[PDB]
Amino acid sequence: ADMEVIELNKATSGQSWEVILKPPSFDGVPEDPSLEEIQKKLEAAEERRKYQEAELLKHLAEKREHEREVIQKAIEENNNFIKMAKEKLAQKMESNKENREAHLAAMLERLQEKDKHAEEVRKNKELKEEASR
Amino acid sequence: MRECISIHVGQAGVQIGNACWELYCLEHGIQPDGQMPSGGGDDSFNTFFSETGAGKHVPRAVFVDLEPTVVDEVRTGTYRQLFHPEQLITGKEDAANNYARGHYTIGKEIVDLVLDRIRKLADQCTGLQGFLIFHSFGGGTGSGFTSLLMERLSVDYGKKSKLEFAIYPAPQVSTAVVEPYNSILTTHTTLEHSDCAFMVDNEAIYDICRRNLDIERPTYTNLNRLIGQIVSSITASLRFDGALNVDLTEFQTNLVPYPRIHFPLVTYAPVISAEKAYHEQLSVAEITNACFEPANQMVKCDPRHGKYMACCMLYRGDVVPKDVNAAIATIKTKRTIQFVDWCPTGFKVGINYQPPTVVPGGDLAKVQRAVCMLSNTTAIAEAWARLDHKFDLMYAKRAFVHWYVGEGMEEGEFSEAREDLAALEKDYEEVGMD
Amino acid sequence: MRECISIHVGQAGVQIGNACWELYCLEHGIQPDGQMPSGDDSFNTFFSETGAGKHVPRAVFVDLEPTVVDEVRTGTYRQLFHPEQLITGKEDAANNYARGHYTIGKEIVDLVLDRIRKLADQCTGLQGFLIFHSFGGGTGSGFTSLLMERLSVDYGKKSKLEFAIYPAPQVSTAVVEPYNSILTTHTTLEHSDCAFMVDNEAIYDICRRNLDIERPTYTNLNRLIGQIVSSITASLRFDGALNVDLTEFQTNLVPYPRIHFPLVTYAPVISAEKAYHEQLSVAEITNACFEPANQMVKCDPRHGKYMACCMLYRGDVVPKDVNAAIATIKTKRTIQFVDWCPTGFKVGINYQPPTVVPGGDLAKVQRAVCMLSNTTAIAEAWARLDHKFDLMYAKRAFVHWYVGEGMEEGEFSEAREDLAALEKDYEEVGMDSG
Amino acid sequence: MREIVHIQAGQCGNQIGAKFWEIISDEHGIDATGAYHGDSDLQLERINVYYNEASGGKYVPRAVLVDLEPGTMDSVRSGPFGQIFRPDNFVFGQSGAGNNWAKGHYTEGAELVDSVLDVVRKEAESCDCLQGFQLTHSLGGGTGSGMGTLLISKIREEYPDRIMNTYSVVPSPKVSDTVVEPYNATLSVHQLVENTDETYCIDNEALYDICFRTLKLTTPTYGDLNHLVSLTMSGVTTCLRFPGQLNADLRKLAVNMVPFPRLHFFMPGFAPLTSRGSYRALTVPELTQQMFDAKNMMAACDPRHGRYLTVAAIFRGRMSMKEVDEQMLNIQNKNSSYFVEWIPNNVKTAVCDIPPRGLKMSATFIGNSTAIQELFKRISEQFTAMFRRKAFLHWYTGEGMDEMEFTEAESNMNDLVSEYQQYQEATADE
Amino acid sequence: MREIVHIQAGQCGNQIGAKFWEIISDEHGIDATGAYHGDSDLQLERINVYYNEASGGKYVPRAVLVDLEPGTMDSVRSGPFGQIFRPDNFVFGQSGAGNNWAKGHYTEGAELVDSVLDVVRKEAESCDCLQGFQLTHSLGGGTGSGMGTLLISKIREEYPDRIMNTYSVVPSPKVSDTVVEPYNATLSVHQLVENTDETYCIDNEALYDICFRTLKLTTPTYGDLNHLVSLTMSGVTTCLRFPGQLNADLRKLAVNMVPFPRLHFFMPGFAPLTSRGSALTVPELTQQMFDAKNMMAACDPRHGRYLTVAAIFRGRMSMKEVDEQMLNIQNKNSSYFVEWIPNNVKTAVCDIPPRGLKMSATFIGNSTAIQELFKRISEQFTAMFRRKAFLHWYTGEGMDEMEFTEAESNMNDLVSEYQQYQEATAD
């Protein structure tokens, strides 16, 4: 049966009041930002975002440099292959030339020695003949 | 004059704004083109609508989104002549469900433009009360852009009230896995800048649409029309010459005993299907009893597990004080209704004579009398606990955190936001101890 | 566009070139005078075009004696080649590698390179060189080695693939063919990318068994060799369902630089008589590739392991029928692959059926296939050759003929030690992994 | 978040890409000449995500067609919707990559890559709001794999703030084109782990197995394999092309699907499984069941062998949204042991009224499952069997590559497997 | 490798040389005036290997005719085909070497050698691509043996890179009674071992034995012996004279036949054996390869092993049958071939049979059994040299005894080298 009704306000399209069933056990109701602060925090976040985008691009730049180093390495290997094939072949053709000329000279010197022996035979025949009877 | 500026942020905020402003137009007799053949009777509608040199009435509102699709529907739809193009503001790319993207990356490029528009609306006010901000906790814009805007609004309008209508995330209609992160992050940054926040859990409204309106799979159009009904009930005494919650400061006075515990529970009745066969009108006793039923709440939580620190009954329509007092007397007789020891057990009651209005062709039946209860109960801490637990499960593994860190946020901000919500949970416990 | 330069060296290389270029002309509709009436323009990889619309082979024919090339110069196709691409000296290499490489070859090598340089100047996308030669002749062995070395200096690592004739006693012209084969293999090993060996005894026996020819001549052997060469180059000269270029042959067939000798198998080889041959399916011609009687080199693949198989189909062949045939081949326990090869099948399909020379020994077939397989069984052919080398070299028999031309005995030891390492390389490569 | 720029590289990339353009053109009512002849506004609402509007009401795919060889280009131009493509968007070389990742990535591919970037830059600069890039390619060859990954890193450098999405075809010995596929695939996975935001793993092993075991095709062809891929790609892109709330753009999809940056490899699922000659039913409970069926996965992994970190489920056709919601809740509750407990509400569902071409009802599942580690282990075992013996290595080192790149790619892929295993074993009670 | 320059020295050399020119002229369709009246294009395809084309379509043998005696020239000019030879190519002295190798090599022969080189240089320099030289001579007299070997070393000095080939007639006590034939033959073998690339050993002992035992000629003459030589020479030069794959030139033949530089002495074989007044099957022809009765060197091929063999079949016969029979003859007789020279038997088939026959077989064998021919000469040499008999015939011409000991040692070393390879195993 206990209910304290208290009229609050009355107006053109409304009416208000407070209904109190029981008063409180404990008497009494007990038991700034700045543009600069905001801006400083937003700009610090922007710098972290830009720093990580820069790190991503720095790594992509490192991949582009590596790509250039593999193209260069393949070019250098092809050039060293050419250089080695060229001097191996020049060495082989020159050794072969020295050898073939040496074999030809040795066999011609053998035939030339036969000619020296032949004139020496001719010499003895001549003194056997003539200087007789 | 007591003008209020409405700020609709992101998809949820903008789509709820479409529903609210459509209902206000119907309630004040304003046509979609801004014309008014002056129904209502009084000129209090001027708190929410300014007037142009051609006799048109224009909402004191700003619609903002980081993407243009949703606001483009407002720019080209039924109410395109109701708003001037300068109050419909959009960027090109959204916040991709990421608070850090909305707060630190994309929001930063449109915030000055939004503040400039708000300043031009404030210049047309002789007695600016403050702001009503509509947004979701879950979206990247609703979370990140709203908190960024709240901070600047505190710098530019220190002694002005800021009231929120916030959408609490629900898996049935959820758009992102990271919604618990966005919710805890935005609550942390907004806590000290907001004066009073009316949370609406999509699951509670979704279940009310299924149970009370017989809608199998409710859409955002169904949910928002019901949200509009609740928002209209809460703003009715600012837009009509009412007697309770006559100014925005009165909301903090009547519902908020401590600055951090500013999340009142909303309950609404009756919610009846338009397609229902000619039913008899519900009495003041029946709609009052429905106020004390968990199934009619805007947030899923158990008031039996908590204590009330303030209670406001906003009746609307064919309602007489004698019938209200008789209804409240029976409820105290059969129910406990435990109040904290430092607050009196009782209610602040308001009757707004203007009838409840429904959108023609909508899902809601036109009723002779309705009631909206706003109660600050410690039981709402259950919604924070559910959200905090989901945050903890993911954050223990640092799941999805790289998305926020990649936008310039630090891990410490996640710890700070979570520690602040742990303090909020302890505050509800301490405040409701005796 | 994707040009291939053909180099035909010595009697075997030149006579096989006569058969190949005659067949390419028949396959592309090029008349003996280089004219082609009024499409698939892939034949441009093997034929250049003059201002008068005449199509000219991208080829050089070289021999140290003029007799064999004189037949080209005065025959049916004398207008097809410009006289400057048919190069001959006066005196041959007398079945001596040393005369081909040094004494006689060094006199004509600059002229041959000058002509190849003029052909390379007409290439916008030179793929490399196709070198046709025997292992046994003094020119085929010695001049080819010298040319291979000079091509590595002028073109670096530009692809050099061979079609090499492995010696057979039935048609052998010299006792010293094992010496010429070992010396050329040693010199050429590091300069060649891939060598397709054709054993004359295997082609001889295929002509006797499959074509009913009592005593096969070079005309019989060469027409069949031309068919195999045309199959290997059909993917470069036509654009079929699946193509394989010079680079793809190398990558798929050569797992290690020295292990570059794929075995060639061809099917079907049917006599122009019979008539009741009943058209062989894709499965039947695929199965025939793993039958020893259809191989171009005498060796037993059951005694070895496959490391790569390239299938070159031509004619009425559909990819579905090829995959079904290769799937049944993968289930054959008797067809073993090295354990370090998860899949060793490269397939190429061309729509153009195997064209046969009018009045030849081969029947017109609807579909044919040429398999190029890298098998460790091919080491049997090297072992056979190495043993004959050892029998003669232990006594220094015939060595004075090479020494008299400027060669040293140390070159015989080095060449033989290199082939001994190659034999051990086939043994190591066919071993299972730990 | 409007425009997507599509790139197709190599034979496989251009074959599945032409098939993607042919299916979505039919769904959007666009004929072979680029003319719109549909009867629904949902078909044109988001047409600009994939098509540019040219003079005279014609729609032209925002697609760049790439190869190091011209034959593929000719076959696409000659194909059913070949004339729809912008002629200047066909960028091709003459040499080919010789099935070698190193030629595609460092030599021949590097020579053609700037011609490709000039064409994708013209498409990108024309965008009002570029979402990012979509690449179709195989990982087993030289062009799609080597040049495709080279393109990704070059695009990452010029558009670091855009989403990079791939449809990556994983090789299988069951339907193989080259002997060096495990090398080309491992070197590409290494690139994808570091430079893509979302990768759909389209496994040829899984496609071959669906055709052989389920469709009873004794000898499946690329046409049979590509029919499953085209339905899958139509399914996974549904939310990018039609009006809807969930995963409506490439970044919202990535935020919902990718909890850890390296774990961005998706296991696509599709129901019903059909052949090009096709049953006549499939109910909502039947469609939801296929989410855990290894037989319905386009990656050769068993979803019951691991746990789903996240799932996007797309239902298409005339079906009850209420029934789909009930069945999706039941499939999660009954299979709680196959979802990580520390990512709450990790399954998001979408329903679209327009079914894929040729079907009345369908389901597509985009799964981020720890079972995808089985696909990487399979590639790794094939890689090690070759690498242990250094087989075919001279073709890569001959292009200037070092052996260290192989060991690094192998380590990164094994670390990825070890990461998936770590989250598979992780409990909520740390 | 086109032109061959032929030289014939002394009586024997000019008698077998005139016979060679008469047989190959008939085979190539060339009459006694040098006119071509053949029927086949195979006859003229390689006509330039042995003949020059003179004014008016006539063919003239690239042959130089040499003798220290001027009667041999007159008899060749008077013989069949005498008018075919270039008149300025007849180079003759007046003295005669008196069956003395020293007179031929050092005295009278040295006085005539420059007139011969004048004529062979003109022939050789006129060649487009000179293969080398072919010499017919005997080893038992003075001109053919002494002057013939002097010519070889002089031509070798001027043309060191050309092939030097000889048809060397070995003496026998059965046909000639000249006592010093073992000396002239040993001094010539010494020269041939060091300066020729290929030498066909035409043994008068073997020729006499075929005529006496097989042809039943009680008293054979040089005409009877030379008929076997002309058929043999036509047979061994078949591959130089007609289009073909195998041993088509003097260097390719040497590379296939000569495994060791000194072992270049060939044992020729021929079937069928005919007289000047008298067709075998393929198996019958192949069997004669191991028949001592068919050898033109008095050695039994079954007494040694073949290092290498060239088998030439002529006439209309099956190449398939020849291939089958040649494989059977080496499989059944594997012990008579050295195992360490694989595929050492090369076969050739020519459609044109020799003059007077329908089918023939010629075998060019490099057999270790040839050491029996050298041992026979060596025993005859030692029987004389041991007593220094007739030495003043050679020392009177300026020679030293040391040249004899050296020639003897070199010939015994040659025998010892054939024996070494005969006994050698593959192991």
Ligand SMILES: Nc1nc2c(ncn2[C@@H]2O[C@H](COP(=O)(O)CP(=O)(O)OP(=O)(O)O)[C@@H](O)[C@H]2O)c(=O)[nH]1
């Ligand atoms: N699902 C499909 N897989 C394909 C198709 N075509 C090829 N592939 C697979 O792709 C892989 C390599 O084939 P590609 O033709 O794409 C190689 P690509 O052109 O990119 O480079 P190159 O090696 O330079 O030719 C291998 O796993 C094949 O089985 C296709 O149409 N569908």
Ligand SMILES: Nc1nc2c(ncn2[C@@H]2O[C@H](COP(=O)(O)CP(=O)(O)OP(=O)(O)O)[C@@H](O)[C@H]2O)c(=O)[nH]1
């Ligand atoms: N088979 C032949 N052997 C012959 C012929 N003429 C001679 N001889 C043999 O040659 C040897 C004697 O040689 P020659 O008569 O040629 C002596 P040549 O003219 O060369 O020198 P000189 O008479 O000493 O001046 C001796 O063994 C004879 O039996 C012949 O026509 N055929």
Ligand SMILES: Nc1nc2c(ncn2[C@@H]2O[C@H](COP(=O)(O)OP(=O)(O)OP(=O)(O)O)[C@@H](O)[C@H]2O)c(=O)[nH]1
């Ligand atoms: N009641 C209601 N909730 C909505 C509506 N639209 C979205 N939501 C909810 O809001 C959350 C998602 O936030 P949104 O407002 O769509 O996102 P946003 O603010 O536009 O942010 P971004 O799109 O990320 O830039 C989810 O919980 C949705 O269920 C709406 O019209 N009504």
Ligand SMILES: Nc1nc2c(ncn2[C@@H]2O[C@H](COP(=O)(O)OP(=O)(O)OP(=O)(O)O)[C@@H](O)[C@H]2O)c(=O)[nH]1
């Ligand atoms: N298949 C085939 N093999 C041949 C042909 N001609 C020769 N040979 C073989 O090649 C080898 C001999 O080499 P050739 O090519 O004739 O000699 P060459 O290269 O001309 O060298 P030289 O004549 O010594 O300067 C033997 O094994 C012959 O059987 C031919 O037309 N076809």
Ligand SMILES: [Mg+2]
């Ligand atoms: Mg939004």
Ligand SMILES: [Mg+2]
């Ligand atoms: Mg030759």
Ligand SMILES: [Mg+2]
């Ligand atoms: Mg390709």
Ligand SMILES: [Mg+2]
């Ligand atoms: Mg005399």
